[PDB]
Design a protein around this ligand. Structure first.
Ligand SMILES: [Mg+2]
Ligand SMILES: [Mg+2]
Ligand SMILES: [Mg+2]
Ligand SMILES: [Mg+2]
Ligand SMILES: [Mg+2]
Ligand SMILES: [Mg+2]
Ligand SMILES: [Mg+2]
Ligand SMILES: [Mg+2]
Ligand SMILES: [Mg+2]
Ligand SMILES: [Mg+2]
Ligand SMILES: [Mg+2]
Ligand SMILES: [Mg+2]
Lengths: 205, 170, 48, 50, 293, 159
RNA sequence: GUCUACGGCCAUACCACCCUGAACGCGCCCGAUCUCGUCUGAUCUCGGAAGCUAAGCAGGGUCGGGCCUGGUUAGUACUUGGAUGGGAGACCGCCUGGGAAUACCGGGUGCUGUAGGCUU
RNA sequence: GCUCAGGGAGGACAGAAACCUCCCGUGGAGCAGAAGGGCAAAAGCUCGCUUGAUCUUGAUUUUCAGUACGAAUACAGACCG
RNA sequence: UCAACCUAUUCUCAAACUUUAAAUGGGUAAGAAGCCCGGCUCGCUGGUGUGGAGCCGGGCGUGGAAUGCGAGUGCCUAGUGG
């Protein structure tokens, strides 16, 4: 018996995490956050599409996992089984409260922990998809189907970054060819000109 | 030719006997290694209480000494002549310190007494070099630097060139 | 019969109606509380 | 009137509505005018205006 | 494996000690309790008599603390005792007494209170502490500062203390730590302290070794043998030292030399040189690799 | 209601700065204070003897008494509608001189030296500090080039 | 140029590794009769000078970690004051002012007081 | 006078855990308690000696009405450790 | 292989976490009770007619930011405390 999300939709209270002080928080519903072919190097998924948000609201854990399943089902029917990488870029840490009646009334009013939400700023990314360069409309359609599981109004933006990295897609291949970026799986490691140059000669050998 | 202040010399030979009891067993083990070394021991108390061993907190359960110099070299050569000047390779710490453990103190040449019995000893020799008083003195305490430390291989080759010993691996 | 508990609402205009008067500035303030050995010395220096 | 603004208006001698005062400009005075500035209109007068 | 203890977080949240506490030379707890003037005393100096005994000489200074540093007024080292007649043996109790006496008499001559405040002209060994006399200007009081010597009985720090006390510095002390205070029966005989002041422990040990065995004698006492100090020399040699100290205490400075300015250390390598050497390392490594390939 | 302890709500106030724990430095001890020296308060947690109350952390007063380890100062505390110029006794290390008096003393001795000078010369110097006046008229040399044209860069939703 | 003794500010001084130290020093070092203190002269204390820069320490090096200090992030985020501004709300824009922090990229790596040596 | 939690490497029975040693170890331990601050030749641990946990008049802070009690802060007069 | 581990990386947080750290704001100061000299007293402090403090005596007025305005003080006191 969960209260509807229009009750706990606005960012009303101070951020109140599951901690030493609020213990007895029931387990959040979403717990798988990254899926797809997540064991895949960054050389083979160039495209990144973000469901970005546009309201300073609170998304619930149940809404996050319903949106995960709605994106996942469409991309496993569209882009094969392991030709994508979904990751939910919000982890719910704010726990919300419930003052339940049944006759005291309001004396001693402080809620038991009910569920766990995520507070979302303007332009904070909700979900993000990493695919190939021709599965772009499948990314747009997947996040468009996943918007309807969330409250509030969200946007969809295909980014200029090479996948789930912080480096621009027009410069990624140039930098990794001149050996400033080193692939290590889901991401890439940056190489400055500040280390001891034993690492420099070890890269260049 | 090497600089004569980098000689591998033993700094101390510390011995103990952990009897695991208090009273008569411990005090005759104290009499054992007083009879060995020629100096009175110190009773090592127990830190904790662990009932699977039958010892409790602040109960005297060990006897130990530390001998220096010439007396340390004689006690050490008796321990190596009971183990035939032959030690394993794993008996060497990473700091070059080494040591071993012998089964009955009759083997060192200590005469038997039925009021005494037999006790196993634990020998542990920490090496050194001229200069390791730096890390222990009071007035300007410093560390001792990297070229001057004792590595494990340069300690074991010291062992098998000064006692002509045999180290066996495993 | 609950009531309002604590308030500092009209207190600011109550204070500044007569004004926050800064303390009394006088030449030669007193000497009580000064270190009594020093104050013995000062009284003998005035006495002689 | 917010009481800071009331005090700065009492130092600028604008008490009634639609009064006016000359004010010479320096760094203290521009900040004094700008605390008040939703309540005043202040400009650079001509010789004919004076 | 093991978790690295000394990582980035360790070094960035690592807090140092002070510089002198890193080098371990000063004890800030005792230094704060020793030098800080009472704040009603209002810029009146608080003088200390620092004794630091090195391996080869003994440094005794007096010092009052200011904000810029520690101003030293007077200084007296053991290695100027050959001017007064102690040839060698500069780090024993007797030379500690001589440099404490030299510090006291040199300071009192710097202040112009040398004819007043003679102290013990002849040394006895028992308790003394100079009393300030009326009308004449008051005696110099400074508090002893031993630093990190464990202040147990028979310490050359307290030798220099007795030196300055017999010189006429009014250092507050008690005769619990002078050599002679026996810990069992709790008295303090003066003649045993006087034997330690005149170095008769050293002379008695010298006669002991030259009776027992001569090889260890020549290994132990060798500069005494070069400077022909027999044990019968010893007491009147230190008496002539105390007399010469008390009748010519002022210090003669060595005159400044025209230094040729030769550079003994390697100066700090500049930025152009260090980025040029890393450019050369990168170029040399690439050319060595491509000519090995 | 809150508690009324002496050190309530002073978690971040009496704590030392980050990486400045440890022994107090000894200049703070070696400074000397006359009476009438204008003195700041900044409480410190390494010592607990002679603590200034949390009403006074940051306030500045005047010394009326100096003792062996502590001074007594006269600070202004505002309580509900009045200001009390009250006496407190603070140990020596919760305290700095105020440079607000020292800048005034510098300006006074500078005004007095250039008053006792240029009185024999006859000229009239200015001694008051007028505030920062408006900028007087000045030419701006655009030597050579035309000024650089600007325009607002169009919105690209970079998120 | 440099060191010792006492320091001040307490990393521009720390930490890891490597190289070099002439003279004076500081050390390591050799001993235990006496002072002293220990299981043990390792420490502390005491008496010395056969040797050694090996260590400490000093100076220097590392496309070093750190620290210090600039740029960038950014006039971004935030924000005093204002509107009968927008929006159903959430929140946002504007005017008047003030204005941060990471990531990322450069520079620096102890200054210095008092007393006394050394560099015949 | 010593350095703590923790970890590494050694050592007869000994082990995951008794005890001995070496090294790293900015507090990750301890300080009676609830938490927050604070602390490394100490405020921690172990010793040695002890009774300033004593007699006494004032001032001041703290809640405050700028009143009490409590608690606390500099002093001052002895008598001591 | 799958693990713990460990080493650089990465995603998301904190009212009762924090290296950094604003805006608003909180004290103090912007002189005549201040400066600069000459000198006496003290049982306090004292190497030192030292240090400090107090007292006399003299000389300094460009009244030492802007802006505004006559101020300080003492009784008695209703009402109020939804
Ligand atoms: Mg609420
Ligand atoms: Mg109501
Ligand atoms: Mg009411
Ligand atoms: Mg001490
Ligand atoms: Mg020795
Ligand atoms: Mg060396
Ligand atoms: Mg070297
Ligand atoms: Mg670096
Ligand atoms: Mg210097
Ligand atoms: Mg020459
Ligand atoms: Mg202590
Ligand atoms: Mg009435």
């Amino acid at each position: 018996g969960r209260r509807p999300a229009r009750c706990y939709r606005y960012c009303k209270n101070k951020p109140y995490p599951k901690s030493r002080f609020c213990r007895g928080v029931p387990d959040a519903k979403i717990r798988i956050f990254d899926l797809g072919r997540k064991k895949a190097k960054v050389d083979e998924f160039p495209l990144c599409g973000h469901m970005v948000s546009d309201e300073y609201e609170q998304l619930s854990s149940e809404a996050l996992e319903a949106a995960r399943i709605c994106a996942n089902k469409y991309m496993v029917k569209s882009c094969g089984k392991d030709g994508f990488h979904i990751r939910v870029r919000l982890h719910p840490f704010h726990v919300i409260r419930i003052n339940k009646m049944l006759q005291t009334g309001m004396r001693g009013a402080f809620g038991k922990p009910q569920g766990t939400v995520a507070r979302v700023h303007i332009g904070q990314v909700i979900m993000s998809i990493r695919t190939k360069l021709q599965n772009k409309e499948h990314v747009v359609e997947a996040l468009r189907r996943a918007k309807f599981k969330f409250p509030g109004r969200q946007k969809i933006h295909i980014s200029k970054k090479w996948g789930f990295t912080k480096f621009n897609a027009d410069e990624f291949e140039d930098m990794v060819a001149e050996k400033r970026l080193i692939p290590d799986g889901c991401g890439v490691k940056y190489i400055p000109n500040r280390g001891p140059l034993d690492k420099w000669r070890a890269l260049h050998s | 030719k090497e600089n004569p202040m980098r000689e591998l010399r033993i700094r101390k030979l510390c011995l103990n006997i952990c009897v695991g009891e208090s009273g008569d067993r411990l005090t005759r083990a104290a009499k054992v290694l007083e009879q060995l070394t020629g100096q009175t021991p110190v009773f090592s108390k127990a830190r904790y209480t662990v009932r699977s061993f039958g010892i409790r907190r602040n109960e005297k359960i060990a006897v130990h000494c530390t001998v220096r110099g010439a007396k340390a070299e004689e006690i050490l050569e008796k321990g190596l002549k009971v183990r035939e000047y032959e030690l394993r390779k794993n008996n060497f710490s990473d700091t070059g310190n080494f040591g071993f453990g012998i089964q009955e103190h009759i083997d060192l040449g200590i005469k038997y007494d039925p009021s005494i019995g037999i006790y196993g000893l634990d020998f542990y020799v920490v090496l050194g070099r001229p200069g390791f008083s730096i890390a222990d003195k009071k007035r300007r305490t410093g560390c001792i630097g990297a070229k001057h430390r004792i590595s494990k291989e340069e300690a074991m080759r010291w062992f098998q060139q000064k006692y002509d010993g045999i180290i066996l691996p495993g | 019969a609950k009531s309002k508990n604590h308030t500092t609402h009209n207190q600011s205009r109550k204070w500044h109606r007569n004004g926050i008067k800064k303390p009394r500035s006088q030449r030669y303030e007193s000497l009580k509380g000064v270190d009594p050995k020093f104050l013995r010395n000062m009284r003998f220096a005035k006495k002689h | 009137v917010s009481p800071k603004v009331r005090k700065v208006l009492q130092l600028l001698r604008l008490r009634q509505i639609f009064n006016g005062t000359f004010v010479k400009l320096n760094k203290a005075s521009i900040n004094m005018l700008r605390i008040v500035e939703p309540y005043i209109a202040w400009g650079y007068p001509n010789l004919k205006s004076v | 494996f093991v978790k690295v203890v000394k990582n980035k977080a360790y070094f960035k949240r690592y807090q140092v000690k002070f510089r002198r506490r890193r080098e371990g030379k000063t004890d800030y707890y005792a230094r704060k309790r020793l030098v800080i003037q009472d704040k009603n005393k209002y810029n009146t100096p608080k003088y200390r008599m620092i004794v630091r005994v090195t391996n080869r000489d003994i440094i005794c200074q007096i010092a009052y603390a200011r904000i810029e540093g520690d101003m030293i007024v007077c200084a007296a080292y053991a290695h100027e005792l050959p001017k007064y007649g102690v040839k060698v043996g500069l780090t024993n109790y007797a030379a500690a007494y001589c440099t404490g006496l030299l510090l006291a008499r040199r300071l009192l001559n710097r202040f112009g209170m040398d004819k007043i405040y003679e102290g013990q002209v002849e040394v006895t060994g028992d308790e003394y502490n100079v009393e300030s006399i009326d009308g004449q200007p008051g005696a110099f009081t400074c508090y002893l500062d031993a630093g990190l010597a464990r202040t147990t009985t028979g310490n050359k720090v307290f030798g220099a203390l007795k030196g300055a006390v017999d010189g006429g510095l009014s250092i507050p002390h008690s005769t619990k730590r002078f050599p002679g205070y026996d810990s069992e029966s709790k008295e303090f005989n003066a003649e045993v302290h006087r034997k330690h002041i005149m170095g008769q422990n050293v002379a008695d040990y010298m006669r002991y070794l030259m009776e027992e065995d001569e090889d260890a004698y020549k290994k132990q006492f060798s500069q005494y043998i070069k400077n022909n100090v027999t044990p019968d020399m010893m007491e009147e040699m230190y008496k002539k030292a105390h007399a010469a100290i008390r009748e010519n205490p002022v210090y003669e400075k060595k005159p400044k030399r025209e230094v040729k300015k030769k550079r003994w250390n390697r100066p700090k390598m500049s930025l152009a040189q260090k980025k040029d050497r890393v450019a050369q390392k990168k170029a040399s490594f690439l050319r060595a690799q491509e000519r090995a390939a | 209601t809150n508690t009324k302890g002496k050190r309530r709500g002073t978690r971040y106030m009496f704590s030392r700065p980050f990486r400045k724990h440890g022994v107090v430095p000894l200049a703070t001890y070696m400074r000397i204070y006359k009476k009438g020296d204008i003195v700041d308060i900044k409480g410190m947690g390494t010592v607990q003897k002679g603590m200034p109350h949390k009403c006074y952390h940051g306030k500045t007063g005047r010394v009326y008494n100096v003792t062996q380890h502590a001074v007594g100062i006269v600070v202004n505390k505002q309580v509900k509608g009045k200001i009390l110029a009250k006496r407190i006794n603070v140990r020596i290390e919760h305290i700095k001189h105020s440079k607000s008096r020292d800048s005034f003393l510098k300006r006074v001795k500078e005004n007095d030296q250039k008053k006792k000078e240029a009185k024999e010369k006859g000229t009239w110097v200015q001694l008051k500090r007028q505030p920062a006046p408006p900028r007087e008229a000045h030419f701006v040399r655009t030597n050579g080039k035309e000024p650089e044209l600007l325009e607002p860069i169009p919105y690209e939703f970079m998120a």
